[PDB]
Amino acid sequence: KLPPGWEKRMSXRVYYFNHITNASQFERPSG
């Protein structure tokens, strides 16, 4: 499995962001 600790966020679109690592992207990892 790719690194955990993520949440879903809003940008007018939904995106995914890491609560521990702060990295933010429109498509999700294996996390």
Q: What token pair was written down for 7? A: 């949440």
Residue 8 one-letter amino acid: K
Q: What token pair was written down for 1? A: 């499995």
Cβ proximity of 17 and 2 under 8 Å:
no
- Where do the domains of the chain lie? 1-31
Give CATH for domain 1-31. 2.20.70.10
Cβ proximity of 25 and 18 under 8 Å:
no
The closest alpha carbon to 15, from 1, 30, 5, 26, belongs to: 26
CA angle 17, 7, 18 (to 5 degrees): 35
Long-range CB contact pairs, 22-25, < 8 A, 24+ = none
- What kind of experiment solved this structure? NMR
Side-chain-facing half-sphere of 26: CA atoms under 13 Å: 3
User: Cα–chain-centroid distance for residue 8?
Assistant: 6
User: Cα–chain-centroid distance for residue 5?
Assistant: 8
